[PDB]
Amino acid sequence: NSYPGCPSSYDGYCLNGGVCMHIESLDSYTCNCVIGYSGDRCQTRDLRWWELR
C-alpha cells in the first residue's frame, strides 16, 4: 500500500527535487522525482518515461 510519510529519521530522502512518500509494501519510505530523476528518490537522474495517463 501507499502512505504519505517521511520523518527526519532519514535525511532529505528526496533530493534534487522530489516529494517524499511512505510505502506499506514493507513499511519502507520512498521518494518521487521528475524527468531526469527518479527511483528510490531522485538518484536515478535519468529519463525513462515514468508516468501513465
Q: How many domains does the chain have?
A: 1
> Which residue range is the domain that position 39 belongs to?
1-53
Residue 24 corresponds to which amino acid? E
Residue 21 corresponds to which amino acid? M
Let me know: does 45 contact 29? Beta carbons within 8 Å. no
- List Cβ neighbours of 8 (8 Å cut-off, separation of 6 or more): none
Cα–Cα distance, 47 to 1 (Å, whole number): 25
- The approach used to solve this structure was NMR
Let me know: does 38 contact 31? Beta carbons within 8 Å. no
Cα–Cα distance, 13 to 16 (Å, whole number): 10
Beta-bridge mates of residue 20 = 31
From residue 11, give the alpha-carbon distance in Å to each of 7, 49, 50: 8, 27, 24
Residue 47 corresponds to which amino acid? L
Cα–Cα distance, 45 to 9 (Å, whole number): 24
From residue 39, give the alpha-carbon distance in Å to each of 1, 46: 17, 9
Looking up residue 4, the CATH number of its domain turns out to be 2.10.25.10
